[PDB]
Design an enzyme around this catalytic site. Structure first.
Site, PDB file in Angstrom:
ATOM      1  CG  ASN A 365      -2.044  -1.091   1.031  1.00 48.94           C
ATOM      2  OD1 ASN A 365      -2.854  -1.025   0.100  1.00 48.94           O
ATOM      3  ND2 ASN A 365      -2.067  -2.075   1.943  1.00 48.94           N
ATOM      4  CG  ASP A 366       4.901   3.195  -2.078  1.00 48.48           C
ATOM      5  OD1 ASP A 366       4.613   4.390  -1.801  1.00 48.48           O
ATOM      6  OD2 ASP A 366       6.074   2.825  -2.322  1.00 48.48           O
ATOM      7  CG  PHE A 367      -1.180   5.887  -0.233  1.00 45.25           C
ATOM      8  CD1 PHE A 367      -1.061   4.962   0.811  1.00 45.25           C
ATOM      9  CD2 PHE A 367      -2.446   6.156  -0.744  1.00 45.25           C
ATOM     10  CE1 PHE A 367      -2.183   4.328   1.337  1.00 45.25           C
ATOM     11  CE2 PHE A 367      -3.575   5.522  -0.224  1.00 45.25           C
ATOM     12  CZ  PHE A 367      -3.441   4.602   0.816  1.00 45.25           C
TER      13      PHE A 367
END
Ligand SMILES: [Mg+2]
Ligand SMILES: [Mg+2]
Length: 424
Positions: A365-367
Site C-alpha cells: 500500500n505505497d501511496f
C-alpha cells in the site's frame, strides 16, 4: 500526554455518480448490524529526506477517483419496516457523502508506536467513526478516512460499515486507493450473491482495562510451529495459520492459570469466497464470512502435544464448512438470525476470538511515499480476549495484535514456551 486535534472535517462524494440505486444485503452482511464499524489503518514513516509536499491533498484527490469505483461507500443504509414485526436492510447508493478528516497528533511518534511494548492508546483515536454500531448507518456515514499527522510520519485509518464490507473487501479498497495515488485495474462488484432459494429482501428480528501487544511470528518460526503441530498430532494437513492460532491460544490460556477441566472456545472467521456458485475474489465488495467456534478443554490444550491436538481440532472444525454447509447457514439465517455482538472488557474469559487474515495485502500500500511500516485494526471492535492477525513486513511472517489485560500480556511475554517461536 499524547493528544490529537482535528484540523479539518469535510464531506466527500463519488464523482460521476449515476442516479440513486439500492443494493441488497446477504446474512453475511446483516450479521454485523449490531457490531462496531470495520476499521483498518496503516502507519507511514517520514524520514528527514522524504518530500511530503502536497501529501494530504494528493491523498484526498486520489481518494475521490477511487470512490468512482466504490459507490456504496458514499451511500447510507436503508431499513424497511415490515408489518411482520420484522425488518430488512439495504444499501441506498445515495452519494450522500463520506467523511475525510485531516488531524494531527502531538507527543506521539512513529518510533514510539513501533517500539513500545504496549500500543499507545492514542492510536485508537487515529480511526474515525469510533463507537458507531453498524445499524446507525441509516443516518451516520458508511465510510470515513482520517489522515493523522505525526511528528515523523502519518497514519491513515479507515472506517467502513461492517455490513458493507468484510476485511477482504476492505483491504481490496485500500490496495486500489494506494495503486491510484501512486500512478487502473479491473472493476469490483457490489451486486450481492444470492442462492435461488432466498429472495433478496431478507426479513428478521433485531435485538479489566484493555491492553494491546504486537507479537511477531517469523517465517521460520511459523514453519517450526507447523511441523511441531503436524508431528505431535500425527498429521500433515494442519496449516501454518492453524498452528499459529493454537500457539497463541495456548499462551493466553496458560496466562489465565485456569482449571484443566475448563471448557474453552476459540472463534475463527471463515472466508467463504471460494465456495460461491461462481467463485469470486476480493473484487466481490461485500461480506462473505461465517463465524465458527472450536471447543476444547483447557487441560487438553495445555498438556504436552496439545499444540497438535488443538490445531487438528481447528482443522476439522473448519473442514465442516463446505459449500453445502454454508448454503444452509445462509438460507436458515432469516429463520434463526445470528449476530456478532461486542460485549465489554471482561477481566477473564473462556472465549477467544480471532479476526483478520495474513492473506490481506497490508504492506503493498505505497501511496507514493513508501510502503507502510505498521498495520493496525481499529479499536472499536477490539476487546479483551480478541486477537487480529496480519502479515508482517518480512515475507512469510505474521503479526498478532493481542488484546488482553496487562498482566495476561505480561505473562505471555514471559512465557518461555510461547516466546520460543515469537518476539515482541
Ligand atoms: Mg475517538
Ligand atoms: Mg500477504
Amino acid at each position: 500526554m499524547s493528544s490529537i486535534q482535528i484540523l479539518s472535517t469535510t464531506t466527500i462524494h463519488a464523482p460521476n455518480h449515476p442516479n440513486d440505486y439500492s443494493i441488497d444485503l446477504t446474512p453475511w452482511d446483516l450479521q454485523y448490524l449490531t457490531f462496531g464499524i470495520n476499521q483498518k489503518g496503516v502507519l507511514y514513516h517520514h524520514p528527514p529526506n522524504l518530500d511530503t509536499t502536497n501529501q494530504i491533498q494528493h491523498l484526498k484527490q486520489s481518494l475521490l477517483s477511487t470512490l468512482e469505483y466504490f459507490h456504496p461507500l458514499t451511500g447510507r443504509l436503508n431499513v424497511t419496516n415490515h408489518e411482520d414485526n420484522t425488518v430488512s436492510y439495504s444499501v441506498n447508493c445515495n452519494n450522500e457523502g463520506a467523511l475525510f478528516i485531516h488531524a494531527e497528533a502531538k507527543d506521539i511518534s512513529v518510533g514510539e508506536i513501533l517500539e513500545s511494548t504496549y500500543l499507545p492508546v492514542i492510536l485508537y483515536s487515529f480511526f474515525p467513526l469510533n463507537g458507531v454500531k453498524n445499524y446507525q448507518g441509516t443516518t451516520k456515514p458508511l465510510f470515513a478516512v482520517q489522515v493523522t499527522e505525526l511528528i515523523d510520519g502519518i497514519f491513515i485509518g479507515c472506517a467502513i460499515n461492517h455490513s458493507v464490507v468484510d476485511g477482504t473487501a476492505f483491504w481490496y479498497f485500500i490496495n486500489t486507493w494506494a495503486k491510484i495515488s501512486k500512478g487502473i485495474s479491473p472493476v469490483p462488484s457490489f451486486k450481492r450473491w444470492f442462492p435461488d432459494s432466498v429472495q433478496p429482501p431478507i426479513r428478521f428480528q433485531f435485538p479489566k482495562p484493555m491492553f494491546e501487544r504486537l507479537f511477531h511470528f517469523s517465517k521460520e518460526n511459523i514453519a517450526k510451529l507447523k511441523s511441531k503441530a503436524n508431528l505431535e498430532a500425527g498429521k500433515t494437513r494442519i496449516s501454518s495459520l492453524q498452528a499459529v492460532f493454537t500457539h497463541i491460544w495456548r499462551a493466553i490460556v496458560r496466562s489465565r492459570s485456569v482449571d484443566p477441566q475448563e471448557e474453552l472456545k476459540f472463534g475463527i472467521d471463515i472466508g467463504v469466497r471460494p465456495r460461491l456458485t461462481p467463485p469470486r475474489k476480493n473484487d466481490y465488495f461485500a461480506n462473505a464470512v461465517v463465524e465458527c467456534a472450536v471447543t476444547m478443554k483447557a487441560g487438553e490444550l495445555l498438556e504436552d502435544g496439545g499444540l497438535g491436538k488443538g490445531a487438528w481440532e481447528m482443522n476439522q472444525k473448519i473442514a465442516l464448512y463446505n459449500d453445502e454447509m454454508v448454503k444452509n447457514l445462509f438460507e436458515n439465517w432469516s429463520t434463526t438470525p445470528s449476530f456478532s455482538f461486542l460485549g465489554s472488557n471482561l477481566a477473564d474469559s473462556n472465549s477467544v476470538m480471532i479476526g483478520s487474515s495474513p492473506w490481506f495485502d497490508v504492506y503493498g500500500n505505497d501511496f507514493g511515499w513508501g510502503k507502510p511500516v505498521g498495520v493496525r485494526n481499529g479499536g472499536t471492535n477490539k476487546r479483551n480476549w480478541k486477537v487480529y492477525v496480519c502479515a508482517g513486513v518480512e515475507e512469510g511472517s505474521m503479526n498478532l495484535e493481542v488484546c488482553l489485560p496487562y498482566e495476561n500480556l505480561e505473562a505471555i511475554g514471559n512465557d518461555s514456551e510461547f516466546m520460543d517461536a515469537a518476539s515482541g
